[PDB]
Subunit: 309 residues, 4 copies
């Protein structure tokens, strides 16, 4: 049976003695566990992302597959960052739990089994970094937390899941078209920090003060959580238009939960030097802007990255 | 037929210039329609002054007509409808309507949208249901309704509690009504008010900077709404700034960036400890609306929290 | 604490044998729970006799307890809840609950589901809302609720009008109530009844055979529900058989195979011409329920149509 | 500009003078139209399906792409049948309209443009037969009518869309994994009828009489619209179990709108000689059972077809 390595970033999701908390694991894989860090995923950050990507890239030859236990609140961010930076061609399957392991009908035990199932399936390779939640296999790019409490909260709300899991078997009927893992230029192996990218929210009577404080602090890039198709309130627009011209990378995304922020529709991106996020929501667009800045600062080149990854 | 007043806030959503009665001629089958332009703005530039203008105007002219319809851009229609859901005291229907396609485009949605919005505003059964949004054959309550997709004509959905009724052939089969107190049944009164408490929104995400939150406390904002992660949780740096702010006067409301579901009281964050308010199903721009109006009522977090549980 | 009665119709949905009080021990924090097995069947074998048993039992024992909870298989829980939504005359809460995972499996959902179903049945605020289904932290009205996915623990959704409230930490934030008349407010009375009118369902699709519909008219069925296509439209052969049937006594209800949305009156099919009834948002198995009970009230299509517009 | 051939099966959806009903078509393609038949799609049937597949296969060399105007009520059935029987490698794009062409804010004009856009995109080839509705590109297998009146009713409810259409451009991020068009054995070129397959509905107190009438009439195959994961009411089960043994092909699908009817879960398919429909809903499962019967009658061989197509 396959060797699967579970990497923990926080508290347990089942019951390392995960094999005894969920004993059916041993029937389908030889499982070992390492505790890379122990934090709540709302405090997730750049430092954790780099050592995770380094650890998976380094240990790729020792194992057949990676399962990562992670909190749910930012799992969709870490999955996309790894989706872009992992160079290992074995499956990397992220999993968490919407109910705590010691509460009634806890979801983590079965989620973990299914995560392991997915990570040991030979059909799972070459589909990029995955998230396995509620009997479903979702790609790291599009998967997002959809509901604040529901066990079924994780959905790929724009293009759908890759496969459903029934009785330890996976019917895979899709694979992500955007370039992932190996197909990307991004290499973080020797980086110790990551370009500073903040996110500002748009609303009625919106303040430019948040955007201005990131401009003042010399942030390399800003992501706008626009309204509608990536639209900005006039104050925020002016502040970010100014900032664009003097070298800040500005990416128009949207607060709207589904749908692309499209190029040349509402906003002359070419005129102002902006970048349209596509279907990347603000926190997802941040992850790609961070990595884009490490290869080029040119707004047209970043846009092409946003259309390719 | 009933008398219905159209209040435009921007460009026209139906073509073929405030006089939409020629653009959708079958409006005269259902109502006697008159129109005024109150402002003319892209909704992405919506603001407190427009909000106060709409509410005072509806409250004053209530006796003059049987119902209103407000044409509004879609980017922020969800914030305006909830603002009005809480300030309008006219018992008559107030239906907001927009268009996800330009009025000059193929299969422009505005003409049928406005038609259905007049149906709704003239329907006898549309009363006491609060301020409404009518889009794509659907009647939506002003609280729960939100813009779900960046481009889709079906974007507007009441994602937590569902719609109030569907509209087929100019008739509505209502089957729900918002149980939260609205319009008349609130204490919020803007009739003598000229400005609104300053309330900003801050986003949470991995490696989130405290700078945006600091700047709004440094500017002396009266409230801050957090677009938290998960069940309204907060990144470390942002937690520290907002916990400070909460004790030194600022009213902090914990909402969530997640598009559906409640931010509940003391799920994990101890709200009573830090003096926080949980928003419930109110997303960050919805929560800003109610906090703004609550701040005109009180400054104490425990009674702002009662307001978020009632309205 | 309130007294709550569990009525089981099949296997146990929570383990660790009618006595579920040991399987979910925290039930004693919220209610005093007693249980009876009334039948023991896989829900795929649900039938009129079980339905009449449940309704008479609830109606007779109403005085004996403060609320019921019914454990039921998920395959047909949506038909039983709507049947009871129309026949139960007990004013007290009736909450149905099931499990999409076997009780012996990893992350079995039954134990927390039953817990939440007792919360709901004991909640004072759960009254007069009609017969309920509680699944996956959600309270759903008995009319609109349907099984949406073959396997998902979140399968049960009120797909046309949304849920009534969400359940967090044993409290419910109700925000809607079904406006359609239910329970006490109906005329349907099964207290003296021993059987139900025979009502079958027939499917529509391209190149559909008339044979299934013919066989139920040949068997003398009292009603036939059509799972039409689109807005309750009918394949040619099936149209002809059912139009014949409608005039020669048989009551035909046009519903739709499409999982959401109303089959409306005279969208395209001239219902008054052929003597048809349109089902509204009632899917084919929901429509069978109401037609069955309407046939015990009357046989005339125009007044069956009023019933489909009221209940 | 590409040559696109519009094939009409019923009434117009815009306004052959479709070029003058929607004049923006001429800017993006050279369009001609033929009226293959004129019926309401609720009366759609086997005869129409065969001549359509024959016509598309025959005329494949004359044009660059096919657009088919079709009623909405059965569009999801015809799209999957063609998805399995078209041998032409140019795009075949089905489109209809949820609002009539002469009513306010009619959807057919813009749907038709987008259908033409999709049919002329070189990126659309090799994705099987498509359905284009409400700015979305959906694969013929999974696409289904979701709502009785909504313009947005057509959704791929299990695996998601292939791409979204904005301003005449398509971001394709998925392609169907199941075998389609050329990759299938099915060839209808010389067939003049198709094996008889009926569908029976399951519910509480369900009658076996419908199933029995199709058994009596010697139907080659039955599709069960089960309850839950493909479950049958005891009468229907017995009738179909008997029928299975004496040569009828029985396929367990489900009335439930999303989710697979999976093998060996609720029902011993091997014991009774049944076939599990997977994610094919009853009307979709009928289309594959019809075509499966033309290559083999063996329940195990049909099951493998249901796992491959």
């Amino acid at each position: 049976l396959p060797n699967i390595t579970i990497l923990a970033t926080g508290g347990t999701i089942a019951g390392e003695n995960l094999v005894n908390a969920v004993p059916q694991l041993k029937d389908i894989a030889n499982v070992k566990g390492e505790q890379v860090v122990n934090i709540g995923s709302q405090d997730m950050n750049d430092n954790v992302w780099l050592t995770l990507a380094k650890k998976i890239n380094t240990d790729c030859d020792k194992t057949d597959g990676f399962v990562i236990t992670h909190g749910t609140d930012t799992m969709e961010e870490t999955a996309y960052f790894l989706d872009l930076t992992v160079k290992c061609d074995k499956p990397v399957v992220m999993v968490g739990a919407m109910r705590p392991s010691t509460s009634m009908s806890a979801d983590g035990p079965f989620n973990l089994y299914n995560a392991v199932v997915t990570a040991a399936d030979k059909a799972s390779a070459n589909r990029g970094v995955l998230v396995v939640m509620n009997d479903t296999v979702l790609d790291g790019r599009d998967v997002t937390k959809t509901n604040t409490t529901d066990v079924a909260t994780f959905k790929s709300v724009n293009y759908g899941p890759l496969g459903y899991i029934h009785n330890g078997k996976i019917d895979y009927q899709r694979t992500p078209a955007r370039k992932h893992t190996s197909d990307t230029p991004f290499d973080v192996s020797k980086l110790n920090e990551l370009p500073k990218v903040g996110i500002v929210y748009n609303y009625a009577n919106a303040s430019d003060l948040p955007a201005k404080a990131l401009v003042d602090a010399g942030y390399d890039g800003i992501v706008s959580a626009g309204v509608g198709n990536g639209n900005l309130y006039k104050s925020v627009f002016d502040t970010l238009a100014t900032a664009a011209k003097n070298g800040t990378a500005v990416v128009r995304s949207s607060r709207v939960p589904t749908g692309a922020t499209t190029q040349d529709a509402e906003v002359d991106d070419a005129k102002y030097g902006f970048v349209a996020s596509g279907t990347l929501n603000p926190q997802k667009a941040r992850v790609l802007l961070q990595l884009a800045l490490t290869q080029t600062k040119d707004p047209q080149q970043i846009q092409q990255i946003f259309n390719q990854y």
